[PDB]
Design a protein around this ligand. Structure first.
Ligand SMILES: Nc1ncnc2c1ncn2[C@@H]1O[C@H](COP(=O)(O)OP(=O)(O)OP(=O)(O)O)[C@@H](O)[C@H]1O
Ligand SMILES: [Mg+2]
Lengths: 87, 257
RNA sequence: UAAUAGCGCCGCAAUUCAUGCUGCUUGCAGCCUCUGAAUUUUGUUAAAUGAGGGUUAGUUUGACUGCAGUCUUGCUUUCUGACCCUGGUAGCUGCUCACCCUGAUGCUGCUGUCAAUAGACAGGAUAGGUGCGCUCCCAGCAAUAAGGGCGCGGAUGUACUGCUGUAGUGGCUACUGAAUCACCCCCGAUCAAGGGGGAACCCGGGUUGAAAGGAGAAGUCAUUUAAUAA
């Protein structure tokens, strides 16, 4: 999981305000940060079954948050997809 | 304090090797190998219960490699108005097997089941007349249908109960009677209590003609009364700084009877 | 302190016969001294089973020819013995937790010493409960079965381990500590390799625990853990 400094850094950049402790922008971005650190270890440690359970959960949460945001506000959804480099 | 130790040692029971105890032990040993049931009778203070307990320590449980214990002699004393369940409870518990809840038939089967297998040869029953009249069917069952000598023990009241049923009287017809002390036997016994039981710092001459008048009237030949009169006198005397019993403290004790 | 009960095994004891034991009537009589089936009993310095994790191209179960003589190979597995350990730091990574109640196929349970902090040191497979074990039971913990209660902030168009977080417990990779044995000791080789020196016993030769094999591919089933979903 992320360092304390790394969470504070991510929440301050994707949060709409410093007090925006849990917007979808924040949650999706944090998940994207974790997933980007976990694919670099899981491509090397191919025998590490316990980490594939962690990855498949963490990707599936990201998708639910994104589907919710898409219907809620397509402009927020489009910007968030850009800022995270997703397709 | 030294007196404290003597007062605390004189209240405590001990067993003396009297000819009446020797006689029973040999008589029971005949009946044990012969596997014949019988009874022991005699007046209340002749020391029947002690002679039997003393006999149980002649026959501790026996064991060898590959064998469960034989428990040759069993001893019990029933509660008042003893039903069949209460008898079976006391046999089972003397063998130290756990007793659960059950109907009387579960206890009966459980009892046969531990008087077999665990080998028993003899069952000794103090105060047999606490048994309810029907339980004797269960005593007879044990004795005929297992290789067990049953030994009833009790006073002249027991026979007054037994005479009420032919079926029992006949299984248990053979008997031994305990009696009272007299003449030379009473005199010789007083010297054993003086020297084995009391063990006071100097001789009290309790076998002397003056002392044996006091003891004979006070005890009437019961070993019980002789034991408890002589201890009470030894106890009281020691408290007065006396290294012996004396005629006056012995008469102080006897006068309470 | 506690663990009473339930369930599965292990013998011990009968009781009933036979697949057994004596006969000849080759099918009956007879019993339980054996060897075995069935029921029921038991928990007795009875007897018998008895899963803490690891270690040898180990030994014996082999082929051929008339039980004697030749040749012999180190494959894949199941036991019995014996010995060793109860681990080390260097990264990566999963899960779990605001705080409470219920407490799950949940975790933990040995001896001795010092602390009596939660942990070190030295022993060790006897290691909570019984003859031996469990998903059962007792004791402590319980966030990491699950359900319910519910505080303040973020979001609030159905999404929300999504906040209150530095520890707990795992996974994986690299190096490393001990045993690398089959009667012990010593020097080596692991796609190969053996050799040298002793102790004990039997009648200068043997002995110094046994046993099994028809192999591959593919589909399918049952339970059992994770993930997703309605
Ligand atoms: N061997 C002995 N040694 C010492 N005292 C004995 C002995 N035998 C009997 N006694 C005396 O008897 C006592 C034992 O109990 P006691 O004889 O009074 O009861 P009991 O006769 O068994 O009773 P009951 O007949 O009513 O069942 C002892 O305390 C003692 O005084
Ligand atoms: Mg009595």
């Amino acid at each position: 999981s992320l360092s304390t400094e790394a969470t504070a850094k991510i929440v301050s950049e994707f949060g709409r305000d410093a007090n925006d402790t849990g917007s979808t922008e924040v949650q999706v971005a944090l998940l994207t940060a974790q997933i980007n650190h976990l694919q670099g270890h899981f491509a090397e440690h191919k025998k590490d079954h316990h980490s594939r359970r962690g990855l498949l959960r963490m990707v599936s949460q990201r998708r639910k948050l994104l589907d919710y945001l898409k219907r809620k506000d397509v402009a927020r959804y489009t910007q968030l997809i850009e800022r995270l480099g997703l397709r | 304090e030294w007196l404290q130790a003597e007062i605390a040692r004189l209240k405590g029971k001990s067993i003396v090797p009297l000819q009446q105890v020797k006689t029973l032990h040999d008589w029971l040993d005949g009946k044990r190998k012969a596997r014949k049931s019988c009874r022991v009778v005699g007046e209340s203070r002749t020391g029947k219960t002690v002679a039997c307990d003393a006999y149980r320590y002649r026959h501790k449980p026996q064991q060898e490699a590959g064998r469960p214990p034989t428990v040759p002699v069993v001893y019990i004393r029933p509660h008042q108005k003893c039903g069949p369940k209460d008898l079976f409870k006391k046999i089972t518990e003397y063998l130290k097997y756990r007793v659960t809840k059950g109907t009387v038939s579960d206890f009966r089967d459980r009892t046969i089941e531990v008087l077999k297998g665990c080998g028993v040869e003899m069952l000794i029953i103090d105060e047999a007349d606490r048994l309810k009249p029907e339980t004797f069917a269960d005593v007879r069952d044990i004795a005929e249908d297992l290789g067990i000598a049953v030994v009833l023990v009790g006073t002249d009241r027991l026979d007054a109960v037994i005479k009420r049923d032919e079926q029992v009287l006949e299984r248990f017809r053979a008997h031994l009677r305990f009696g009272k002390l007299s003449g030379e036997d009473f005199k010789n016994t007083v010297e054993m209590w003086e020297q084995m039981v009391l063990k006071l710092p100097v001789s009290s001459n309790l076998k002397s003609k003056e002392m044996l008048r006091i003891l004979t009237s006070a005890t009437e030949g019961y070993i019980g009364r002789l034991d408890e009169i002589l201890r009470e006198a030894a106890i009281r005397s020691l408290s007065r700084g006396l290294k012996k019993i004396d005629k006056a403290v012995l008469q102080e004790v006897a006068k309470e009877y």
